[PDB]
């Protein structure tokens, strides 16, 4: 089933700040905002953790779209291959979640990768979930849904139950 990260990195405060630093032309900004909020709450409802959106400066979870190299050692690779990636909880790059601008992202109303699904996966890694061996899990390593029992068991193992 579920994986964490080695030595169970996790947010050490009850409040975790997040910021959407860069948007996609594929979607209205407010749509990315609402879907990120929905993704975070799918995890947050299970655990004693609150998310706070900020619109400036450096939040704990920095979220954004980028093409090619974007300041970490994991440059994006244009259309196809890698779609997105995210970092275990920690300072700086830890918690951050990046989406490749060279794909197409949808709110469900158009053609594209489902951004809610993808953001729930990435933000799982942003909270300290690794990949699951359970094909029903949002944290399964490969790409209308809910967290699986495995997803919920894993996140509650790391943070405890709300």
């Amino acid at each position: 089933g579920y994986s964490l990260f080695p030595n169970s990195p996790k947010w050490t405060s009850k409040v975790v700040t997040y910021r959407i630093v860069s948007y996609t032309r594929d979607l209205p900004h407010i749509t990315v905002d609402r879907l990120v909020s929905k993704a975070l709450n799918m995890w947050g409802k299970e655990i004693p953790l609150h998310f706070r959106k900020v619109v400036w400066g450096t939040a704990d979870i920095m979220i954004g779209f980028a093409r090619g190299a974007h300041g970490d050692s994991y440059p994006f690779d244009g259309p196809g291959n890698t779609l997105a990636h995210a970092f275990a909880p920690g300072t700086g790059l830890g918690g951050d979640a990046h989406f490749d601008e060279d794909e197409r992202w949808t709110d469900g109303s158009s053609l594209g990768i489902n951004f809610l699904y993808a953001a729930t996966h990435q933000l799982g890694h942003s909270l300290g979930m690794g990949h699951s061996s359970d094909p029903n899990a949002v944290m399964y390593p490969t790409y209308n849904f809910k967290l699986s029992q495995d997803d919920i068991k894993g996140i509650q193992k790391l943070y405890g139950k709300r």
């Binding site: 990195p9 050692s73 990636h85 995210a86 970092f87 890694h125 690794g130």
Partner: peptide, 5 residues
Amino acid sequence: XGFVX
């Protein structure tokens, strides 16, 4: 992709 760092 989930990375450490």
